[PDB]
Design a protein around this nucleic acid. Structure first.
Ligand SMILES: Nc1ncnc2c1ncn2[C@H]1C[C@H](O)[C@@H](COP(=O)(O)OP(=O)(O)OP(=O)(O)O)O1
Ligand SMILES: [Ca+2]
Length: 430
DNA sequence: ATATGACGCT
DNA sequence: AGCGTCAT
């Protein structure tokens, strides 16, 4: 009753760039705009591995982790853009730089948490309060929400997409309690008005479109974001949760897409997130541990407390390449040449990072994978990173792994290496 | 048939 | 410290 917390204390958004690498390439090359197209890496491998897909190409069944030659069988007129290759490997600089463009714009509105190359969470709680004061209790016109969906509406006693969107939005707004500045629903609404403005600024200043979710915490914000894509935003209210969760596969909730989620389903004999509400907090803790059980008990009720972390920059800067099948690294001289290649890119990214962001990495993590391990991470070791020099980094990396070689023959490497990974970590202010 | 990044556990 | 999980 009066002491039951409802998880309605913050306004949180998740902004997600639509088919991001595709948009970066389509901005650059107007001939790709409004076409089925994809971004590929490593051309000579069956036309290249597809890593991003325009929405026009998705309608043909083109997906990520399809070979371009195979995608062409579904979509013969698919256009392609290829990732830059430097020193024999894919180089994602263009996309990291485009990401900075977007993250700098979002940072003007609120403090962001960089979640990936193209996602950021936003804590809008404070900006909502401030915008609510300015508003002076005047209503919110639908015109302030031109791309917003209200999940679960319309409901109760037209047949085209936009018509249904507006119907839901009218029911939502007609019901709003603009009289109370502490109404959660009103706070989410104003949050959505801000996110409209944020998304318009991104598109104006970059050409890039995105989707967004607005709710009371990160999990619901992320869920909401995926509900109406591309180029749209979705508001998931607290009151929307019971219906939304009643048929929501558990695996759709962030952190449940893998093994834990699969064990929730199997152990408990359930399918949908809402079905969790019938278990006590102690039962969930018993099955899944103290932390996971507490988290699940609250989350199935729409409640989650993970903060939007004030962090706009990555905490690690890494470079890696796989060397599959026959290309696996079999000689000492190959291993050293590729470590050098990785180390050169790393040095380049590190030096840029030091000038831009006033910090230095201090630990180098070296990871490899020998042929056999189904296992991705076969072995991991660190050393000190004391100088941004590619030859030292590559030599150091070699030293900390050189005894993984089982070959009595000096010049050979056994078993062959199928992955090398160099990662700069443990940043200090500079 | 074939590249990153964050965080949890021990 | 080194390994595992989950995600873009
Ligand atoms: N497994 C991967 N390997 C390489 N690059 C990837 C991988 N997954 C994602 N990316 C890159 C390419 C994407 O454009 C970008 C953002 O990922 P993601 O948001 O999952 O897809 P997307 O932005 O391309 O489509 P969407 O409209 O579904 O957001 O990161
Ligand atoms: Ca995206």
């Amino acid at each position: 009753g009066p002491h039951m917390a409802t998880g309605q204390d913050r306004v949180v958004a998740l902004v997600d760039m639509d088919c991001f690498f595709v948009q970066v390439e389509q901005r650059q090359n107007p001939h790709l705009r409004n076409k089925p197209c994809a971004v590929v890496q490593y051309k000579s491998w069956k036309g290249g591995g597809i890593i991003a897909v325009s929405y026009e190409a998705r309608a043909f069944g083109v997906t990520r982790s399809m070979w371009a030659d195979d995608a062409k069988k579904l979509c013969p007129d698919l256009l392609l853009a290829q990732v830059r290759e430097s020193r024999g490997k894919a180089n994602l600089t263009k996309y990291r730089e485009a990401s900075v463009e977007v993250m700098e714009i979002m940072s003007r509105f609120a403090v962001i948490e960089r979640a990936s190359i193209d996602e950021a969470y936003v804590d809008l709680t404070s900006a909502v309060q401030e915008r609510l004061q300015k508003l002076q209790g005047q209503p919110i016109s639908a015109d302030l929400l031109p791309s917003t969906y209200i999940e679960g509406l319309p409901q109760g006693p037209t047949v085209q997409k936009e018509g249904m969107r507006k119907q839901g939005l009218f029911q939502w707004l007609d019901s709003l309690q603009i009289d109370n500045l502490t109404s959660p629903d009103l706070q989410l609404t104003v949050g959505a008005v801000i996110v409209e403005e944020m998304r318009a600024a991104i598109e104006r200043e970059t050409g890039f479109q995105c989707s967004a979710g607005i709710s009371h915490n990160k999990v619901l914000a992320k869920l909401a974001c995926g509900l109406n894509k591309p180029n749209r935003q979705t508001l998931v209210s607290h009151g929307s949760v019971p219906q939304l969760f009643s048929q929501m596969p558990i695996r759709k909730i962030r952190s449940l897409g893998g093994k834990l989620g699969a064990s929730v389903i199997e152990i408990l004999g359930i399918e949908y997130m809402g079905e969790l509400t019938q278990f006590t907090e102690s039962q969930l803790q018993s099955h899944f541990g103290e932390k996971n059980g507490s988290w699940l008990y609250a989350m199935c009720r729409g409640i989650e407390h993970d903060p939007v972390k004030p962090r706009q920059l990555p905490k690690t800067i890494g470079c890696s390449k796989n060397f599959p099948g026959k290309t696996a690294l079999a000689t000492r001289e190959q291993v050293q040449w590729w470590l050098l290649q990785l180390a050169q890119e790393l040095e380049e990214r590190l030096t840029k990072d030091r000038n831009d962001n006033d910090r230095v990495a201090t630990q180098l993590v070296v990871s490899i994978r020998v042929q056999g391990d189904k296992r991705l991470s076969s072995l991991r070791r660190c050393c000190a990173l004391t100088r941004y020099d590619a030859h030292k980094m590559s030599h150091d990396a070699f030293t900390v792994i050189k005894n993984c070689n089982t070959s009595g023959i000096q010049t050979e490497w056994s078993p062959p290496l199928t992955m090398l990974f160099l990662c700069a970590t443990k940043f200090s202010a500079s």
